[PDB]
């Protein structure tokens, strides 16, 4: 390590923490060492100064060592928290698409925050509690063993065994309550966040009172659970305090039975009572430490089980890269369903040669966007296989496949940033020439120009500050900056007017020559000039061929095109 | 109802004070038996008294602390719940510009910090404000009656130095705490924005860039937190220095009273026991003042972000919107989102009752802006909107928003079943209404064919459903609401022409007294509308039937010739 000297200094400060509980009994030992009127004339000032120094300097050194070890350890602790956060973020982005589609934001946020905070406190308390408490208790047991007190050490170890057994049982009880408390907290936050994401929906339907009521129910449930958990905590604390105070009372009774008025040895009475006043804290701390360790272990196990769920899409060991010389797309008996109970895509097989401009039309919910998701290997198909340039998709690394094609999604999402940043996100470090070329290609050059502070205009969350047509155009500009050999369009021009769509199609036909392009849309006025059209229905390829051919065959595509041309 | 509970808690506090005041009384009786000749009975009684006093006193202290905690748990959790409910409510009371331009991470961080700080504020308030007053008044009275005058003056001067040092170091720490909170919020907001674009990140393969940017934000936050905690440690060591110096000074004063003996048998004993009982409140009060300061500034910031003057506010005691003949009128309406860019200038048109009107025009001409303005999301700069000859601004927001049902361009669904989304149209919607709306939006057979159909999860924002299925569900919600005015904003953009014709056929077959507004680009969907409004540069350029507009050889004729060209 590079900061090993830092943790060494922290451990040294911990060891120096022993100095306060070492100097505390020294005052009593020096005072009782003098029997009566110890140092009457001259050493009276000396013993007074010894008392003052011991007390004040010991307490000050204890607090000073605590704050100094905290200050020196802050850097290491925050670096550990930052590394943990980065790795959590990374592994979170590595998760599958089914998760991010069916997730609940509030519960995940609560679990992640609880895991981070609890693991940090674990990392602190391990080295700050386990070592000093063990050292202190062992030193006390050794001091009591070297003395004539033999029943003392046996009673102490038996009482500590009873203490840890009771702490274990009540900690199991507290864990039982904490599970319900955490469940209710997660549900309450998830309900609130979902209510907040549907703000426009709530306002459209005027159901603010209903959202408030449901969140209130979740919150009062969580409040009751927390009250019960804290009462169990208080019960554990009073049981631990009972055991500790009974041990201290027994030690005091033994030391008074030794000699009522006097003391057995010089140090015995004072040393024992001062060590009880110093030892009531480690015994109270050990139960809290066991509780914190148990709870942190269970919550970190929950987080790492939720995070390390096997990602559905995983590259084969020593998988090659996707080499695209002639970009073709082939589906070979591809059968897929999102869940096992509903088969979405049935036996589907089709071919898309290089340089072709192919269309995929069909009814609502027939699985065209499913074809788009499968081509990008978001889900592995049940049967059959997908091929790009005669190469299987699953048998190739995800990185090369996903970089070799650029898809415009049906519902686009934009970063809360300027239009310029969103457009330049297409490729890392995009030159302004590429950005301007994509803006002119996507029909936003005139629009951004007419905007005040145009390229720096904020688009808001998910790009909702822009219009539908503008958002679609920005998505097309991103995918144009990416410049893939295969450019997929998923209902991109649904919000655009016909003029902008005609302009952008003319641009694409004017420049794009070597790209294989597949487009899926419902308004058939946009794809009637495609090379071939695929009519998809109930997840099966029903018709395939040119627009004129499909219109002459008097099939489903001809029916849909006659239905659209009706006024 | 739970005032009796906090009364009992204060009584438990008083019992803890009784134990802390009976400990030095027990020690004073111990010394009374030290100077007085004892015997068998007195020796037995003083041994029993030492053991009982010590053990039962510490046991009662810890037990009273835990019992105060247990008794206060209920009231504290109810207070936290009430605060959370009011925060949630006032958060939903905000305007649309806020929720559109917000950054989720920083707002969530601010709300969580405020909520988790107010509980501890109320706790330390009820555990410090009362006991500090009681302790300081009792100690000052005892030192003034029995003890000397220099004692209280030295104590007050040390307290003045302590509070001055706390003031200075807290002034120093405010900047660092503010910087730490700002950086934490920015980092979390960046992470949340990265996660919301998960599909985008996967489409462009920019995980490394997102990780690097988040790492930058996180290391900035880490440096800020290190500085803040170091300043905290400096305040703590300064406070500890002052406290230990005062304790050493008091002990030195009582040893100066008499080295070997005591001036009064109770004087030195009371002072040393009072030091051993006051070292804890002095250590706690500085931390409590710091926590109170930070929580107060956090709560002030939260309520400043929440209580920003809401843009849309109903006029005082405004009447209800009475709708007998539902019409929509725009009268010289001039509006822009930002002051520098005027979106909609000089627009005036009429939509009579029972008509099926369309709003067509170029991209970004302000159609969805018309939808936003009709629902009173923003007040217009000039002009006015009228419903049934009644102004919108002079009417309550609730009645207006209930009088209209809007299908948005971008629909959003709760992470719940299809049944819950459809039933959201009206409070406590009967399943007959849900089935009727499902039949109206052409989903009855679809939901039937689904396994566990009505209970099928739609995921967050309904992304587990298709585009067309999602649009149909939005239409079903708006049909369940059953408003007199039905606005559609690009609702059937994802549907095929067959489903759109089926749902329009159903609606025209049933809907007779409904006023319908439609916004679309695909003119095959609105070519049978009663009237069409051509919107251009934020102005009504053409109005009339499809045949009329196509005969006038205008802008609509150009658009319909461009769409019908293949
Ligand atoms: N929240 C907002 N912040 C800033 N500008 C906005 C906001 N909402 C809309 N606009 C702007 O107002 C203008 C009107 O756009 P509008 O949303 O009406 O698009 P539209 O015409 O309905 O959709 P399309 O462009 O697809 O036809 C656009 O230029 C848009 O950029
Ligand atoms: N996560 C999921 N879980 C279950 N089913 C899913 C999921 N994602 C998609 N589907 C199913 O796939 C189908 C939608 O895919 P498809 O590509 O047909 O939508 P689409 O063509 O965009 O719809 P439309 O044409 O109606 O806009 C639906 O039947 C839907 O239930």
From Swiss-Prot, chain A:
Segments on the Periplasmic side according to the record's topology features: 29-50, 147, 254-268
UniProt domain ABC transmembrane type-1: residue ranges: 7-295
CDD domains named among the record's database cross-references: ABC_6TM_ATM1_ABCB7
Transmembrane stretches, start-end: 7-28, 51-73, 123-146, 148-170, 235-253, 269-290
Topological relation to the membrane, as annotated: Multi-pass membrane protein
Top-level EC class: translocase
Domain ABC transporter: 329-563
UniProt: ATP binding residues: 338, 362-373
EC number: 7.-.-.-
GO BP terms, alphabetized: monoatomic ion transport; response to mercury ion
Cytoplasmic side: 74-122, 171-234, 291-567
Keywords: ATP-binding, Cell inner membrane, Cell membrane, Ion transport, Membrane, Mercuric resistance, Nucleotide-binding, Translocase, Transmembrane, Transmembrane helix, Transport
Location of the protein in the cell: Cell inner membrane
Reported impact of residue 287 to L: Abolishes glutathione-dependent ATP hydrolysis
Binding-site positions, glutathione: 174-178, 237-240, 284-287
Consequence of substituting residue 163 to F: Strongly increases basal rate of ATP hydrolysis
Subunit comment: Homodimer.
Protein family (similarity comment): Belongs to the ABC transporter superfamily. ABCB family. Heavy Metal importer (TC 3.A.1.210) subfamily.
PANTHER family the UniProt entry points to: ATP-BINDING CASSETTE SUB-FAMILY B, ATP-BINDING CASSETTE SUB-FAMILY B MEMBER 6
Task of the protein: Mediates the ATP-dependent export of glutathione-conjugated substrates, such as heavy metal-glutathione conjugates. ATP hydrolysis is stimulated by glutathione binding. Protects cells against toxic heavy metal ions, such as silver and mercury ions. May also mediate the transport of glutathione-conjugated aromatic hydrocarbons, such as dinitrobenzene.
Name the UniProt record assigns to this protein: ATM1-type heavy metal exporter
Gene symbol of the encoding locus: atm1
């Amino acid at each position: 390590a590079v900061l090993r000297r830092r943790v060494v200094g922290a451990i040294l400060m911990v060891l120096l923490g022993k100095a306060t509980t070492l100097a505390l009994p020294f005052a009593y030992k020096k005072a009782v060492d003098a029997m009566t009127l110890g140092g009457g004339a001259q050493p009276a000032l000396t013993v007074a100064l010894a008392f003052v120094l011991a007390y004040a300097l010991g307490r000050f050194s204890g607090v000073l060592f605590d704050n100094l070890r905290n200050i020196v350890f802050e850097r290491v602790g925050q670096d550990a928290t930052r590394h943990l956060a980065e790795n959590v973020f990374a592994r979170l982005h590595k998760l599958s698409l089914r998760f991010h589609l069916a997730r609940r934001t509030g519960e995940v946020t609560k679990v992640i925050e609880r895991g981070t905070k609890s693991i940090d406190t674990m990392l602190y308390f391990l080295l700050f509690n386990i070592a000093p408490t063990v050292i202190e208790l062992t030193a006390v047991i050794v001091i009591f063993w070297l003395n004539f007190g033999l029943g003392l050490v046996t009673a102490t170890i038996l009482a500590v065994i009873a203490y840890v057994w009771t702490t274990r049982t009540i900690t199991e009880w507290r864990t039982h309550l904490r599970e319900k408390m955490n469940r209710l907290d997660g549900q309450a936050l998830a309900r609130a966040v979902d209510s907040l994401l549907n703000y426009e929906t709530v306002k459209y339907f005027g159901a603010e009172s209903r959202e408030e009521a449901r969140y209130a129910s979740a919150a009062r449930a969580y409040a009751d659970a927390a009250v019960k958990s804290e009462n169990s905590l208080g019960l554990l604390n009073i049981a631990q305090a009972l055991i500790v105070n009974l041990l201290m009372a027994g030690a005091m009774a033994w030391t008074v039975y030794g000699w009522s008025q006097g003391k057995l040895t010089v140090g015995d009475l004072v040393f024992v009572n001062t060590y009880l006043t110093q030892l009531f804290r480690p015994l109270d701390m050990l139960g809290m430490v066991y509780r914190t360790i148990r709870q942190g272990l269970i919550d970190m196990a929950e987080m790492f089980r939720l995070i390390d769920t096997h990602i559905e899409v995983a590259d084969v060991p020593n998988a090659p890269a996707l080499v695209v010389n002639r970009p073709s797309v082939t589906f070979d008996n591809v059968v897929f369903g999102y869940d096992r109970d509903r088969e979405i895509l049935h036996g589907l097989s089709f071919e898309v040669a290089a340089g072709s401009r192919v269309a995929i039309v069909g009814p609502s919910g027939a699985g065209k966007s499913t074809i788009a998701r499968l081509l990008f290997r978001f889900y592995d198909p049940w049967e059959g296989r997908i091929l790009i340039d005669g190469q299987d998709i699953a048998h190739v690394t995800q990185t090369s496949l996903r970089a070799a094609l650029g898809i415009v999604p049906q519902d686009s999402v934009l970063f809360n940033d300027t239009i310029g940043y969103n457009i330049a996100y297409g490729r890392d470090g995009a030159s302004r020439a590429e950005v301007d070329a994509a803006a002119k290609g996507a029909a936003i050059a005139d629009f951004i120009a007419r905007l005040p502070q145009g390229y720096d205009t904020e688009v808001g969350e998910r790009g909702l500050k822009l219009s539908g047509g503008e958002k679609q155009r920005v998505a097309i500009a991103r995918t144009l900056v990416k410049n893939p050999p295969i450019l997929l369009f998923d209902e991109a021009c649904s919000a655009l007017d016909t003029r902008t769509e005609q302009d952008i199609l003319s641009t694409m036909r004017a420049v794009a020559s070597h790209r294989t392009t597949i487009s899926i849309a419902h308004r058939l006025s946009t794809i009637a000039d495609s090379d071939t059209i695929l009519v998809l229905d109930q997840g099966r390829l029903a018709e395939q061929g040119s627009h004129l051919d499909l219109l002459r065959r008097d099939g489903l595509y001809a029916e849909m095109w006659a239905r659209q041309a009706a006024e």
